[PDB]
Write a protein that binds this ligand. Sequence first.
Ligand SMILES: [Ca+2]
Ligand SMILES: [Ca+2]
Ligand SMILES: [Ca+2]
Ligand SMILES: [Mg+2]
Length: 124
Amino acid sequence: TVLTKGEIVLFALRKFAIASNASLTDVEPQSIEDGVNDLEDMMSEWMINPGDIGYAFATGDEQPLPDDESGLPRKYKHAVGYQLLLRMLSDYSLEPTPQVLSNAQRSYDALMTDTLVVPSMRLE
Ligand SMILES: [Ca+2]
Ligand SMILES: [Ca+2]
Ligand SMILES: [Ca+2]
Ligand SMILES: [Mg+2]
């Protein structure tokens, strides 16, 4: 295994459960199987914007499963997992901790952009 859909989902579900418990709302997190549908849907939305990161979608009649490879390298786990977490928190009006918000924004920025160091146009 490299990085399964289930592992990404569990990363988010674990953190959701912590937030949910803290808020006393005591919302039960969805199953890993249903969280995979949530991830699949988020990835589908991203295809529209900001674009394709190479996720391996279930096609045709296939149902995505926790043990399916995500198509992503392990280094993407936090970036995608934190976005899935923000999605889940938002569903139950739970505000993310400042740490979660920061981790999500920094990992997302790192996933979607790069900063290149080049000789200046004047020098080139
Ligand atoms: Ca492995
Ligand atoms: Ca891929
Ligand atoms: Ca389908
Ligand atoms: Mg970067």
